[PDB]
Design a protein around this ligand. Structure first.
Ligand SMILES: [Zn+2]
Ligand SMILES: [Zn+2]
Ligand SMILES: [Zn+2]
Ligand SMILES: [Zn+2]
Ligand SMILES: [Zn+2]
Ligand SMILES: [Zn+2]
Ligand SMILES: [Zn+2]
Lengths: 108, 108
């Protein structure tokens, strides 16, 4: 089934939090990478996560506000007006036939 | 030492071959995913490759002419006009702070 991302809530007050959820995770997943923007881009990588070891490693775009959970959910806290826009998840699979999906939220 | 892709040769005769090589591979690499086009996109995945097991899995853009190697290079033989343009490699790393790079060749 097709990986999709949903922000809850979509519309977020500045200084509050958003949770980005993934639906239809693939069965053979081994880990995750979250990105700022609409495209998988290593300079825009917020955090990587290995399921088996439960290790999160910040990427270049990490800002001290993002936490990734084992089901791929991403919490971003202390959102600012500059955060409005798109976010992209990759689910890394054991055969490296990886999947990705993009979602968005809005800060007011 | 940013990851980069180069085609050898850059100008490729139809029916001959091209090698896409990668410079500055990360040390903690665990595998590779090659794509047709300018981004990581599952609909354009040529092949995924796990270094440890040497298992290659084709994606939708696989054409039977591409081979992937432990040094991350992609060899395309019997090049056709459909093959021109951009290709993107993602190097999957053990921390999933993955890196990608894009290159191109021209067929004549
Ligand atoms: Zn699925
Ligand atoms: Zn980039
Ligand atoms: Zn406000
Ligand atoms: Zn607005
Ligand atoms: Zn305002
Ligand atoms: Zn070179
Ligand atoms: Zn490097």
């Amino acid at each position: 089934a097709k990986l999709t991302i949903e922000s809850t809530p979509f519309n977020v007050a500045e200084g509050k939090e958003v949770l980005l959820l993934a639906h239809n995770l693939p069965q053979n997943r081994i880990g995750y990478s979250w990105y700022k923007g609409e495209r998988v881009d290593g300079n825009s990588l917020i955090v990587g996560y290995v399921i088996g070891t439960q290790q999160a490693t910040p990427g270049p775009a990490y800002s001290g506000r993002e936490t990734i959970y084992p089901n791929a959910s991403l919490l971003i806290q202390n959102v600012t007006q500059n955060d409005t826009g798109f976010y992209t998840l990759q689910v890394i699979k054991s055969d490296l036939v990886n999947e990705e999906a993009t979602g968005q939220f809005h800060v007011y």
